[PDB]
Amino acid sequence: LHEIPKSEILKELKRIGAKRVLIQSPEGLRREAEELAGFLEENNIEVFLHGEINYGACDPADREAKLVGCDALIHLGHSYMKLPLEVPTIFVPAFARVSVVEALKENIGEIKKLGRKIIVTTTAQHIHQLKEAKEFLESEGFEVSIGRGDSRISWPGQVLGCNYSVAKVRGEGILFIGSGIFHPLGLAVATRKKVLAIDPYTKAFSWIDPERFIRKRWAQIAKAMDAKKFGVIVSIKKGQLRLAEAKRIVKLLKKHGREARLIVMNDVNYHKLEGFPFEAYVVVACPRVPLDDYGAWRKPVLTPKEVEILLGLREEYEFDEILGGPRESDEPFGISIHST
Amino acid sequence: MLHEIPKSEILKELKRIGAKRVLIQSPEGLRREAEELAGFLEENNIEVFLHGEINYGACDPADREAKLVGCDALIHLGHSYMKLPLEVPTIFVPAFARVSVVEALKENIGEIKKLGRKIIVTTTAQHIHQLKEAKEFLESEGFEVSIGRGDSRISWPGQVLGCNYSVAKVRGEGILFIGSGIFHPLGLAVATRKKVLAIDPYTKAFSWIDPERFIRKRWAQIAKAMDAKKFGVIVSIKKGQLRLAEAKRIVKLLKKHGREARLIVMNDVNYHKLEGFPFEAYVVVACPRVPLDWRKPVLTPKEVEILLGLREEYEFDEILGGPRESDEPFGISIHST
Numbered sequence: 001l002h003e004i005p006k007s008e009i010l011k012e013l014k015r016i017g018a019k020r021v022l023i024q025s026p027e028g029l030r031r032e033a034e035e036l037a038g039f040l041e042e043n044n045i046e047v048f049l050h051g052e053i054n055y056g057a058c059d060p061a062d063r064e065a066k067l068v069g070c071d072a073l074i075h076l077g078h079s080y081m082k083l084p085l086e087v088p089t090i091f092v093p094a095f096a097r098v099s100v101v102e103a104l105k106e107n108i109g110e111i112k113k114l115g116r117k118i119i120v121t122t123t124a125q126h127i128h129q130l131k132e133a134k135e136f137l138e139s140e141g142f143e144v145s146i147g148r149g150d151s152r153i154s155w156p157g158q159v160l161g162c163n164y165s166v167a168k169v170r171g172e173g174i175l176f177i178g179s180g181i182f183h184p185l186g187l188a189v190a191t192r193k194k195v196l197a198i199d200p201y202t203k204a205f206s207w208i209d210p211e212r213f214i215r216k217r218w219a220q221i222a223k224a225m226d227a228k229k230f231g232v233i234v235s236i237k238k239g240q241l242r243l244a245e246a247k248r249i250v251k252l253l254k255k256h257g258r259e260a261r262l263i264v265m266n267d268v269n270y271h272k273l274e275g276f277p278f279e280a281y282v283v284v285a286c287p288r289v290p291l292d293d294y295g296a297w298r299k300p301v302l303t304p305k306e307v308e309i310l311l312g313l314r315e316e317y318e319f320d321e322i323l324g325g326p327r328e329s330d331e332p333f334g335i336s337i338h339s340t
Numbered sequence: 341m342l343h344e345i346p347k348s349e350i351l352k353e354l355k356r357i358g359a360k361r362v363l364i365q366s367p368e369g370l371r372r373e374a375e376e377l378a379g380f381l382e383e384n385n386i387e388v389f390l391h392g393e394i395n396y397g398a399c400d401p402a403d404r405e406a407k408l409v410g411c412d413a414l415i416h417l418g419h420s421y422m423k424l425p426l427e428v429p430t431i432f433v434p435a436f437a438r439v440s441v442v443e444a445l446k447e448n449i450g451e452i453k454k455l456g457r458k459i460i461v462t463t464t465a466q467h468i469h470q471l472k473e474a475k476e477f478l479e480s481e482g483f484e485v486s487i488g489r490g491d492s493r494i495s496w497p498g499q500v501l502g503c504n505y506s507v508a509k510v511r512g513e514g515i516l517f518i519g520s521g522i523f524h525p526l527g528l529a530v531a532t533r534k535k536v537l538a539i540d541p542y543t544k545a546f547s548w549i550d551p552e553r554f555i556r557k558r559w560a561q562i563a564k565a566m567d568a569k570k571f572g573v574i575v576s577i578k579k580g581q582l583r584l585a586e587a588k589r590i591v592k593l594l595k596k597h598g599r600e601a602r603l604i605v606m607n608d609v610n611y612h613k614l615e616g617f618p619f620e621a622y623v624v625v626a627c628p629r630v631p632l633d634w635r636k637p638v639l640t641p642k643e644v645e646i647l648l649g650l651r652e653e654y655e656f657d658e659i660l661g662g663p664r665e666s667d668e669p670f671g672i673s674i675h676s677t
């Protein structure tokens with residue numbers, strides 16, 4: 001459950017006959033990746049570690065595995081999203097232990113301000129708590145709405161930084177259970193509904209006001225109203241490649257008398273591009289890169305949605321989401337194995 | 341200042357193969373030139389994508405990436421071809437420097453005479469097109485000029501790379517190196533065990549190479565590493581840098597000497613990516629220019645062979661190729677494997 005189940009992982013590997021495996025890992029599970037590796041090697045399975053810092057299941061290292069002759073990939077810390085996989089892949093999601101009900105009870109008076117029918121949302125590390133959160137809220141008199149989400153989502157109620165489809169359901173206001181600010185803000189902007197965030201660790205709460213964020217984006221668009229040369233960036237990460245939408249933005253920019261060039265990268269960062277003559281950039285990939293820029297972009301960097309405001313093709317601010325298709329099943333609360 | 345990109349020649353080669361969508365990679369210097377070429381190809385009804393990575397060598401063609409985004413051809417700016425399986429037709433565009441090499445030699449005749457009569461002459465890609473003149477000059481000064489063909493990693497006789505000095509493994513009293521920087525002459529010195537004179541064509545300055553300080557600094561890394569139980573052994577998936585068999589051997593050997601070792605797979609080998617891993621020391625088995633330029637000790641395969649005591653003298657790590665059939669043109673080339 002909350003422990004890396006080294007036994008279950010071995011059993012799946014021995015079932016599909018895996019002899020050589022690659023392990024991806026996010027920054028907080030680097031040490032666990034090497035402990036797993038040593039355990040499988042004791043059990044006669046050669047193990048490579050993937051040296052890149054992985055940021056999501058949108059970026060499986062399956063093609064790299066097939067290159068170094070691995071017959072399977074282990075993806076630590078995230079759950080499957082619908083992608084073609086070139087080697088059989090085991091997803092090992094990370095579940096935080098914290099019980100969320102305590103923070104809900106402490107804040108029930110604020111939660112009432114959301115209204116009778118509420119939408120409840122959290123991130124992957126608290127997804128297993130969602131049933132406990134639901135029972136409690138219903139037991140206090142709420143009707144609880146929880147969206148399934150699309151094929152980029154792994155369980156009902158789960159939000160990603162670039163996908164909030166699980167909140168596009170009937171309901172009067174949105175509850176977010178989790179730490180930090182980016183997800184609740186994305187909820188408010190993507191749904192235009194009252195969003196209430198509760199941190200399960202501190203029990204602190206926050207009503208999300210997107211105005212401050214939206215104004216910072218309006219200034220970004222303003223800095224680019226001066227620009228004539230545009231770079232339009234795609235990432236070739238399997239779950240981030242948006243070729244058609246990027247080509248669309250290039251054609252659109254040219255239709256309005258601006259120069260635009262499509263740029264192919266893997267990891268998207270400004271330093272690699274600063275020798276180029278472009279005056280502003282459009283990231284058509286993970287929107288957390290232009291929207292959550294800590295300060296590294298020294299030229300205006302925009303989302304596709306913001307570009308359409310710039311050219312004057314859209315009046316209201318719309319959050320850039322990467323959307324999937326119908327998801328006919330749900331991922332387990334545990335390890336999963338996928339091959340295509 | 342380099343010689344200008346030949347836009348007309350490149351476009352004609354693309355039309356000769358009917359290319360409709362091309363990807364262009366460029367190195368740090370040639371970013372403005374990349375987009376200049378893109379606009380010209382586009383104005384000739386050819387869709388062009390730019391590669392946003394900083395390319396660092398023909399050992400890293402972006403041909404897989406081009407195939408992925410639907411391009412039917414790849415333009416590799418600033419480097420000459422090295423023997424590699426290519427997935428899309430690729431056009432190589434060497435950059436050649438305008439600066440006069442012979443003017444630099446003329447300022448330093450006296451220093452060159454100290455090398456010997458029969459001398460080995462080497463340069464980098466940006467001056468290869470003036471290598472014939474430099475040799476004629478030197479032979480007019482009484483030198484016997486010895487120039488090696490080199491192997492399949494090399495594009496022209498007498499060209500050195502940061503990772504391959506095969507053109508210098510020939511008969512001679514000493515090595516002359518024509519180019520800027522100190523890394524190439526350092527490797528030349530360690531790899532050939534001969535006296536090396538470096539002449540910088542842009543400044544006319546010269547330098548007699550003494551590798552001792554560099555070797556001593558390298559042993560401090562080796563010494564540091566002699567206490568480590570846990571090693572990370574790194575490879576790069578770049579087509580010209582992948583050294584999987586050697587990396588595996590290094591793993592097996594570290595384990596035979598009572599040390600733990602893990603193979604690590606990367607594209608760009610950056611230390612900042614590895615900080616969370618539990619390894620006490622690192623071996624880069626890819627482009628040697630990365631360990632030979634951290635926080636934990638990071639070693640080349642030659643250097644870890646010293647730590648384990650299977651090797652005594654210091655050695656530069658090099659990626660060797662095999663025999664080279666023919667030579668690359670002093671201009672644009674087009675290959676498709």
Ligand SMILES: CSC[C@H]1O[C@@H](n2cnc3c(N)ncnc32)[C@H](O)[C@@H]1O
Nearest residue numbers: 055056235237240266267268286288
């Ligand atoms: C937590 S996953 C999102 C984070 O990972 C990084 N990230 C995700 N996808 C990419 C990408 N394609 N290129 C560069 N950085 C990315 C971004 O900095 C973002 O803050």
Ligand SMILES: CSC[C@H]1O[C@@H](n2cnc3c(N)ncnc32)[C@H](O)[C@@H]1O
Nearest residue numbers: 396576607608609610626627629630
């Ligand atoms: C310019 S020739 C090679 C240069 O690019 C960088 N480089 C080459 N290969 C790699 C690699 N595999 N990973 C990271 N940096 C590299 C090195 O720091 C060196 O300065």
Ligand code: SF4
Nearest residue numbers: 056058160161162286
């Ligand atoms: S927010 Fe961006 S980085 Fe995170 S899962 Fe979605 S696409 Fe991947």
Ligand code: SF4
Nearest residue numbers: 396397399502503627
């Ligand atoms: S391996 Fe190193 S020195 Fe050789 S071409 Fe690539 S980056 Fe240059």
